[PDB]
Amino acid sequence: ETKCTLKSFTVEKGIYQTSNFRVQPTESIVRFPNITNLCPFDEVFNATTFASVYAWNRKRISNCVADYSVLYNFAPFFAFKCYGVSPTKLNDLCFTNVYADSFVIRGNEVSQIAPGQTGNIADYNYKLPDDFTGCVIAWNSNKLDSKVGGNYNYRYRLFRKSNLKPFERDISTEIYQAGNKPCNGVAGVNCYFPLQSYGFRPTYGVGHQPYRVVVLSFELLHAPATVCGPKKSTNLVKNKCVNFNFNGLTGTGVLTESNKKFLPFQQFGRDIADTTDAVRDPQTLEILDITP
Amino acid sequence: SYTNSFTRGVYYPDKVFRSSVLHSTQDLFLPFFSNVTWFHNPVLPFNDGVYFASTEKSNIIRGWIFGTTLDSKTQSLLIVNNATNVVIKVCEFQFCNDPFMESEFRVYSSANNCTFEYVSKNLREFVFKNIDGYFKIYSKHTPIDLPQGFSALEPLVDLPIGINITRFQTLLALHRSAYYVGYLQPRTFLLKYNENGTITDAVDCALDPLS
Ligand SMILES: *[C@@H]1O[C@H](CO)[C@@H](O[C@@H]2O[C@H](CO)[C@@H](O)[C@H](O)[C@H]2NC(C)=O)[C@H](O)[C@H]1NC(C)=O
Ligand SMILES: *[C@@H]1O[C@H](CO)[C@@H](O[C@@H]2O[C@H](CO)[C@@H](O)[C@H](O)[C@H]2NC(C)=O)[C@H](O)[C@H]1NC(C)=O
Ligand SMILES: *[C@@H]1O[C@H](CO)[C@@H](O)[C@H](O)[C@H]1NC(C)=O
Ligand SMILES: *[C@@H]1O[C@H](CO)[C@@H](O)[C@H](O)[C@H]1NC(C)=O
Ligand SMILES: *[C@@H]1O[C@H](CO)[C@@H](O)[C@H](O)[C@H]1NC(C)=O
Ligand SMILES: *[C@@H]1O[C@H](CO)[C@@H](O)[C@H](O)[C@H]1NC(C)=O
Ligand SMILES: *[C@@H]1O[C@H](CO)[C@@H](O)[C@H](O)[C@H]1NC(C)=O
């Protein structure tokens, strides 16, 4: 190596700088913060009573952390299709707010909850715009929402003067006028009641049994920091040249127990000439020095 | 009337510990020896942050209200404190033009479309600022017309609202049985850090040739 550095075959006595020694770092520890305020998905999926189709319950989710690994890994889920976003990477792209609509429709009508569909459900009760971005889910609930003798509390509407617009709701109960003679709000001939409650029973066939539905839909208008998915904070090692990532602070070096005392709102410390030389561990809240 | 701050309205520009290091910053500060209004109440402007001190052993100052119109048709913030504890809130309101047993709260008459909730002598300083949809609040409580001294203000809150602000007010507890307002401008300061990491002194670098 000396002969190569000098470009010769005879080196005379001396002392020669030949190269450099640089310790090597192994593994990459990515630190971060908890989840804390998270998405209370345990309510929109587990309420004891779900709404009806003509009047669907819309619950919004504020700024939290969303753990979709609870819904993806949980249950049979007879249908699960996500349209704008790929179902797997739901943890790296986040949006301003999510909404979770819910209802109870029939089995053979689940295929109507999709962008660009037609039918008694997609034209009169719940219409999804063609520019959908969320992701639909639906599962069977025959053992809960079905009583022997008929369950007459679910009330899809089947008559309306015009097709619904995307994401509208109509709970009016006026009498539909079919003919040309007004009926002044009473049933009779050519005037009908526009609600046609399902006759749910346990001894039905698949395609006529109740199927609960949840429709997550995402929106990102202009908010810079919003609800987002969860990340990670690998265990923290010490006394080894490591590649570390403190809730944003990316660096390399040896980590060591400190004996300085930050003020209880300061995250990391800097030197003169402005280099990060101490951090605080988010989870345990202890100060650690960073030496190269 | 009007009064003169002396060296007031210094806050820690951010996290990151620090010790003896005359560190230099550019930010929005309240210039030294400024012209601060005196109040013994009306709609004020905001325009770029606000310094706000007060004094009273009882608690007459019971929070502020912010926004552009202080009514419906646009959103606003509301920060309140009954004898219980603080209540931050963000809806569209309908605010009394003069909003203010022990029964109270003639403040608003509407709470629509709420997009954020939260529930739970003396000198009490506050610095309010609003950058990139975040509404930052620094504060300090030092106990004994203002006096003369140095005391740096530590960050309290952070709210990712998005709200626009152009005006603000105050809230007071009536009688049935003193406060100042500075404004902040882009200045350059030189902060002296202690060995524990606290700001003990400062220099406003636009005062006199010495600075
Ligand atoms: C939906 O709610 C039910 C009841 O509230 C949950 O059933 C509970 O499951 C846990 C875990 O096995 C048990 O310890 C409880 O005893 C169960 N509750 C009852 C009343 O027996 C169910 O886990 C919830 N489902 C989801 C997805 O959260
Ligand atoms: C983030 O979560 C961790 C655990 O996942 C919390 O660590 C706990 O800290 C308390 C100290 O008050 C210990 O008594 C617990 O034993 C810790 N738990 C574990 C599993 O180690 C940590 O406190 C959380 N962050 C915050 C800010 O509270
Ligand atoms: C503050 O400005 C007003 C504006 O007219 C002026 O009258 C007053 O003297 C000023 N106060 C000081 C302390 O300079
Ligand atoms: C204090 O005011 C808040 C404002 O809504 C209210 O929620 C709370 O109940 C009040 N305290 C008591 C004891 O009522
Ligand atoms: C805000 O409230 C008004 C009146 O209550 C309502 O018309 C409007 O839809 C609300 N905003 C949203 C986004 O729903
Ligand atoms: C605040 O008001 C200005 C008026 O010039 C407007 O252009 C701006 O869009 C408003 N802020 C937001 C976040 O919309
Ligand atoms: C804080 O600073 C004082 C004086 O600068 C020093 O005596 C003390 O040890 C420091 N630490 C404390 C009070 O925890």
8-state DSSP, A164? P
The CA-atom distances, in angstroms, between A127 and each of A56, A112, A121, A122, B110 are: 12, 9, 8, 5, 32
Say which amino acid occupies A247.
Answer: N
d(CA A292, CA A145): 63
Nearest Cα to Cα of residue A242 among A171, A181, A291: A291
Residue type, B156: L
**Rg of the Cα atoms in chain A:** 31
- Residue B185 pairs in a beta bridge with B29
| Torsion angle defined by CA atoms of residues B146, B150, B155 and B157, in that order, rounded to the nearest 10 degrees | -10
H/E stretch holding A4: helix A2-6
Nearest ligand 1 atom, CA A70: 27
Atom number of ligand 7 nearest to Cα B194: 5
Pairwise CB contact (< 8 Å): A263 & B17: yes
SS3 A196: coil
Q: Is B12 helix (H, G, I), strand (E, B) or coil?
A: coil
DSSP secondary structure of B153-207: BEEEEEEE-----SEE---B------EEEB--EEEEEEEEE-SSS-EEEEEETTS
Distance CA A138, CA A105 (A): 10
Q: Strand, coil or helix: what is A103?
A: strand
Minimum-distance CB partner of B16 among A62, A261, A267 = A267
Residues of A in contact with B133 (CB under 8 A): 223-225
Supply the Cα-derived Rg of chain B in whole angstroms. 18
Q: Backbone breaks in chain B (C–N > 2.5 Å) follow which residues?
A: 40, 100, 120, 144, 177
Q: Nearest-5° angle of CA B192, CA B136, CA B157?
A: 95
Contact A224 B133 (CB under 8 A): yes
Which H or E run includes A41?
helix A41-44
SS3 content of chain A, % helix, strand, coil (to 5): 5, 25, 65
Which residue's entry shows tokens 């400062």?
B202
Task: Give the experimental resolution in Å.
Answer: 3.8
Quote the tokens at residue A114. 């999709």
Q: SS3 of A159, please?
A: coil
Which tokens hold the place of B172? 């007071």
- In 3D space, the residue among A131, A64, A140, A142 whose CA is nearest the CA of residue A96 turns out to be A64
User: How many angstroms separate the alpha carbon of residue B73 from the centre of ligand 6?
Assistant: 14
For residue A261, give the ligand nearest its CA: 7
Q: How far apart are the first and last CA of chain B?
A: 29
Cβ neighbours of residue B176 closer than 8 Å, sequence gap 6 or more: B101
Q: Checking DSSP bridges between strand B35-39 and strand B179-181, what pairing results, if any?
A: antiparallel
Three-point CA angle B103, B108, B111, nearest 5°: 115
CA–CA gap between residue A205 and residue A67 (Å, rounded): 34
Q: What is the distance in A from the centroid of ligand 5 to the CA of A40? A: 24
First to last CA, chain A: 27
Identify whether the C-beta of residue A64 lies closer than 8 Å to the C-beta of residue A98. Answer: no
Experimental method: cryo-EM
DSSP labels, B45-78: E-SS-EEE-BB-SS--B---BEESSSSSSS-EEE
Chain A, nearest residue to B157 by Cα: A265
Probe site for chain B from A259, A263, A281 (most B CB atoms < 10 A)? A263
Please answer yes or no on whether B133 and A223 come within 8 Å at the CB atom: yes
Residue type, A12: E
Q: Quick one: tokens of B164?
A: 């626009």
